[PDB]
Paper text:
The [name] Fab fragment binds to the [name] viral surface within the pentameric building blocks at a site near the fivefold axis. Five [name] Fab molecules attach to the north rim of the canyon that constructs the “star-shaped” protrusions surrounding the mesa [see coordinated submission by Wang et al.15]. The interaction patch in [name] comprises all six complementary determining regions (CDRs): L1 (residue 30 and 31), L2 (residue 51), L3 (residue 90), H1 (residue 32 and 33), H2 (residue 54 and 55), H3 (residues 99-101) and the light chain framework region (LFR, residue 33 and 48). The epitope recognized by [name] contains 11 residues, primarily locating in the [name] BC loop (E82, K83, V84, D86, E87, D89, Y91), [name] DE loop (T130), [name] EF loop (K156, E159), and the [name] HI loop (T229). Tight bindings between the antibodies and [name] are chiefly due to extensive hydrophilic interactions, including hydrogen bonds and salt bridges. In these cases, the neutralizing epitopes, at the most, partially overlap the receptor binding sites, and thus these viruses may evolve by mutating residues in the non-overlapped regions, thereby abrogating neutralization by their antibodies without impinging on receptor recognition.
Echovirus 30 ([name]), one serotype of the species EV-B, has emerged as one of the leading etiological agents of aseptic meningitis and caused extensive seasonal and periodical outbreaks throughout Europe, Asia and South America in recent years. Furthermore, [name] is reportedly associated with other diseases like viral encephalitis, acute flaccid paralysis, hepatitis, and even acute diarrhea. As with many other EV-Bs, [name] is believed to utilize two types of receptors to gain entry into host cells: CD55 for viral attachment; and FcRn for viral uncoating. Neutralizing antibodies could possibly target different steps of viral infection, including blocking viral attachment to the cellular receptor, interfering with viral uncoating via over-stabilizing or destabilizing the virus and physically damaging and/or aggregating the virus.
Residue numbers in the entry:
A (entry chain H): 1 to 130, 135 to 216
B (entry chain L): 1 to 213
Amino acid sequence: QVQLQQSGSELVRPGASVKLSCRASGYTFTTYWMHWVKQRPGQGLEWIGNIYPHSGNTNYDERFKSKATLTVDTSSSTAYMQLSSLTSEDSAVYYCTRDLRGFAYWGQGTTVTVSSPKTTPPSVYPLAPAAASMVTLGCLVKGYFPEPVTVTWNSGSLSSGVHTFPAVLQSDLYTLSSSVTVPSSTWPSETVTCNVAHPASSTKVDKKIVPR
Amino acid sequence: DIELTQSPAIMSASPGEKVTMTCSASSSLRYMHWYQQKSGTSPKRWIYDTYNLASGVPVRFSGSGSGTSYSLTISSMEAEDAATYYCQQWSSNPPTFGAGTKLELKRADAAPTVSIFPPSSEQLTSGGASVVCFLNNFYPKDINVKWKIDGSERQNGVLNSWTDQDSKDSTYSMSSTLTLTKDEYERHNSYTCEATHKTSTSPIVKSFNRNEC
């Protein structure tokens, strides 16, 4: 089987050269076309270019030229797809399609958000009402800058009615939601908490939910 | 001039009906590829060389289409035929490829619940005012939402997030949420939401005031 997946890259300070590392080793070595598929959060699938290992011929496309190089090294069997002189529009999921009659062998992909930002910690605010059989719960997140965030409810014991809401953008700050439904026999009987985490700022915020 | 995509945007079909796709191309080709790109996960291969096969695609999937028009027809929709399908064509000046065809298994249309939440003490001490009304478990996708406070409408700071498709209920759940500041909350009293939906005639409306604690 073509092992294993692609690598990860985080936000890099502007001016340095980041580098992806696409680690498909399913040899088949080394005569194929490693075409890199890139897709925005606008759900459109675009093409970043391909590379050929037997002689060394790369390619490019009009919306990603100058200077996205696709270097090849058959000793390590990796394909490099990072673009320098970048802007913030390169914040998109970056796949790795191998060559067949179609685009059959993809990778798993990585999203690389690049800017000159500041990593902000999250802050759990209690969403609790101040009557009926079941009440929906939740705790709002407001103002975390990089897209790594964590979603838990009771650390793996009340993950039934957790709806995963997107962090749509306003004022350059991500705002998602995580609402869970509780029955009246456990509220306010057991102490419910929500614990979110930010890997990029390495900050943990917790809050216990109280009836107001 | 010049973009190429699949012609119908968002489809919907109950398990048992005909699902026929339609791709439009800016330039002619000979072979056409078709995929099954689920949400969050990497795409797979579904139909290549306009008809042939895949690794795990069943025998009911059929496809054709030559020139600038392609068509991948599902014979009968099952529980595993709900994916965003895109097409492709290798080139020699790529067109480029299309967007993807989102489609949802149809069922009985359900009326939501609208849960408005009052902001607690800790938010106003930090200095925030975020009033929500979570629309949960509705069908279909479309709701023309309205935020009106104290008689007149309000559309500034209104944010809308869409939790993706569920597997046990097979419905959608929204977060209708506007954001204000701590001084704009103490001048308005009744915070409410109307969910205009095609199931119920009147939108369900809940009311609460600020002078009670």
